[PDB]
């Protein structure tokens, strides 16, 4: 019968669009997740904390060593830890069916990821979590266990399966976790829109809204 907790849900279409992102430089490798959508990769801005890394993108449909990331057109969601990267024409695109929306206080979320195997990928899903908005920011708190490496993993509503955000932050001592929410009309405004792209974008933490957080970088 109907009960407190939601029943079985299919997260596989989300998992099919999750990518591994490696930004490699002399003496440092940034390893995060991303979300593919058409010719676009959606990632954290902090993937590009370090300039001029060689970017490798692993997907269910191939592995793409795009090399120097500074040549790529990018579109930041200004004020929050999300960036959209446009791939070259020779990068085979993802489908364009995922739904994105802002979270609400009705939502609970599961983290979704992917494992890469020889002939296939497999889907991974976490326990569901309550969420709490961090005032004057795009950050929402969640309680799902994460390791360094899991930034960029989608947080998915168990109400309607929409992607609400991607993992971003952890507290430096108490282990609290935070994801960054997608804005309203994200696909229409950032993906479908022909304008607003550039190659000369550089990461600046000061351009993200922090509210009462102090970022330790």
């Amino acid at each position: 019968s109907k009960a407190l907790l939601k029943g079985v849900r299919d997260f596989n279409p989300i998992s099919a669009c999750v990518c591994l992102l490696e930004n490699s430089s002399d003496g440092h490798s940034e390893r995060l997740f991303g979300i593919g959508f058409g010719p676009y990769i959606i990632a954290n801005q902090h993937l590009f904390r370090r300039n001029n890394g060689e970017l490798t993108i692993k997907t269910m449909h191939g592995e793409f060593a795009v090399a120097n990331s500074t040549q790529l057109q990018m579109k930041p969601v200004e004020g929050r830890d999300i960036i959209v990267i446009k791939m070259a024409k020779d990068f085979p695109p993802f489908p364009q069916k995922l739904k994105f929306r802002q979270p609400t206080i009705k939502d609970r979320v599961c983290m979704v990821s992917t494992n890469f195997q020889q002939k296939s990928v497999s889907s991974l899903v976490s326990e569901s979590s309550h969420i709490v908005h961090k005032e004057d920011t795009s950050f929402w708190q969640h309680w799902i266990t994460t390791k360094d490496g899991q930034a960029g993993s989608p947080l998915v509503s168990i109400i309607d399966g929409n992607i609400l955000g991607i993992h971003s932050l952890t507290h430096t001592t108490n282990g609290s976790n935070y994801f960054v929410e997608f804005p309203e009309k994200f696909v229409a405004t950032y993906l479908d829109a022909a304008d607003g792209w550039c190659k000369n974008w550089k990461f600046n933490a000061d351009k993200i809204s922090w509210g009462s957080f102090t970022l330790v970088e």
Partner: peptide
């Protein structure tokens, strides 16, 4: 308070 990118 004090936070870091999880990367």
């Amino acid at each position: 308070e004090t936070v870091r990118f999880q990367s």
